[PDB]
Design a protein around this ligand. Structure first.
Ligand SMILES: O=C(Cn1c2c(c(=O)n3nc(N4CCOCC4)nc13)C1(CCN(C(=O)Cc3nc4ccccc4o3)CC1)OC2)Nc1ccc(C(F)(F)F)cc1Cl
Ligand SMILES: [Zn+2]
Length: 419
């Protein structure tokens, strides 16, 4: 069951609703992330998606489940017409709202007869008073802004119509905005978050097969220098990795240890852990971005703000917490699209493997969730199957494995695909 690997667990009516109106068994981790953060946290989202495969459910499902109203703001007229028809045929009442259509649909929208209203950014700019009325009389579950990259002057597909969608948060500060786009440009999403005036936005990135990441799992011995020696190359007196390198460790003690023995070879490296000031941390980034230091030995803490294109190696010195955290950590590697490697070095005596450590948690539901996650991360590490296939299976939809051409099976895919 996939529903086991979601936190919170989608309730029984949520599952019923998905099968009834969309015809699916379970939510994928990213879909659930976006949907739940909309419904329960009312949190602005930026959803990066390489295709429209599982893209619609993110903004269509929420207003259907609560039975209120969702607003999709898009310039893609014919794509909007196809989705309006698909919703109508799935017994979801939906319309295209524009100046031409207004006389037939507007009264019905105002009296709450539509779950999902598609509009152009042109039309939306004029009728902010209509939006405030709908918030007041029904309540708007969310506003989806598709092709959100069109708000950016520095993007490749700029649209004048998008300029005044900034006023949505001024007009509706309580209503969450789901900004959708097909570009993984870090500068454009900063334009999207800025121009749409988004607050503490959840960022997600799916539909990409990351063919330039090689995955390996490898038994850890005990001796640190023994374990890392394979990854090291000397140039004169000092030692160095082949490129920019991140070594995530499960404990704060380990980051100090690993950094300790890596220093003895005069390696250009530094720590980044929980128990320190958000001041020394600021420089380590700027050093690492400017290639002043080569390696960073960190915990789960380091990563969220990393925009470094040329990360060549990620190493998990010890089994990671779970697949969620692992997916995030490896996802930072090789953003430039050049060959990078992601190695796990694990032993059975790692703190994220012992089950009789989580028995301390007395909340039944949460304890069972953490055990399913530990079991599944364990199943991945011991696997003799394709590391990429396990990860795509769990995180991405079926059509990302199908669309994944000419990497799975090759000597650059994973240790299991090699031998
Ligand atoms: O790689 C991806 C998707 N993807 C992800 C991230 C990312 O950066 N990129 N970057 C890409 N590229 C797509 C292709 O073009 C280059 C960039 N893809 C992803 C992140 C996003 C979330 N994140 C955070 O720390 C939060 C956060 N980020 C922020 C950025 C700015 C500001 C605030 C932020 O807050 C961790 C990194 O995780 C997913 N999928 C994937 C596909 C196949 C395989 C396989 F090979 F194993 F099979 C493994 C994986 Cl992981
Ligand atoms: Zn493989």
């Amino acid at each position: 069951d996939d529903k086991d690997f979601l936190w919170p667990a989608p309730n029984e009516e949520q599952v019923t609703c998905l099968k009834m109106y969309f015809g699916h068994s379970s939510f994928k981790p990213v879909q659930w992330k976006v949907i739940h953060s909309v419904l329960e946290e009312r949190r602005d989202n930026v959803a990066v998606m390489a295709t429209g495969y599982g893209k619609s459910l993110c903004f269509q499902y929420p207003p259907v489940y609560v039975g209120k109203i969702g607003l999709v703001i898009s310039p893609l007229i014919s794509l909007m017409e196809d989705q309006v028809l698909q919703l109508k045929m799935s017994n979801i009442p939906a319309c295209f709202l524009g100046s031409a259509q207004s006389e037939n649909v507007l009264t019905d929208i105002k009296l709450g007869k539509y779950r999902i209203v598609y509009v152009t950014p042109e039309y939306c700019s004029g009728n902010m008073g209509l939006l405030q009325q709908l918030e007041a009389d029904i309540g708007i579950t969310l506003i989806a802004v598709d092709e959100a990259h069109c708000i950016s002057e520095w993007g490749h597909d700029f649209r004048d119509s998008f300029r005044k969608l900034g006023s949505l948060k001024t007009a509706l500060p309580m209503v969450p905005i789901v900004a959708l786009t097909a570009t993984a440009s870090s500068s454009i999403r900063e334009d999207i978050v800025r121009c749409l005036n988004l607050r503490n936005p959840q960022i997600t990135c799916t539909g990409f097969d990351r063919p330039n990441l090689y995955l390996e799992v490898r038994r850890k011995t005990g001796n640190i220098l023994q374990d890392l020696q394979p990854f090291l190359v000397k140039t004169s007196s000092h030692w160095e990795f082949e490129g920019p390198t991140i070594i995530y460790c499960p404990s704060r003690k380990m980051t100090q240890q690993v950094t300790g023995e890596l220093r003895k070879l005069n390696l250009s490296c530094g720590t980044y852990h929980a128990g320190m000031s958000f001041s020394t941390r600021k420089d380590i980034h700027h050093r690492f971005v400017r290639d002043e230091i080569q390696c960073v030995i960190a915990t789960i803490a380091f990563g969220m703000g990393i925009n470094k294109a040329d990360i060549r190696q990620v190493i998990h010195y010890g089994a990671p917490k779970d697949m969620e955290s692992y997916y995030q950590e490896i996802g930072r590697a090789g953003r430039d699209g050049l060959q990078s490697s992601c190695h796990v070095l694990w032993a059975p005596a790692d703190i994220n493997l012992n089950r009789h450590l989580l028995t301390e948690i007395r909340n039944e539901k949460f304890r069972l969730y953490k055990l399913k996650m530990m079991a599944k991360m364990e199943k991945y590490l011991h696997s003799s199957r394709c590391r990429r296939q396990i990860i795509l299976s769990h995180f991405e939809d079926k059509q990302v494995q199908k669309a994944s051409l000419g990497i799975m099976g090759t000597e650059k895919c994973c240790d299991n695909c090699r031998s």
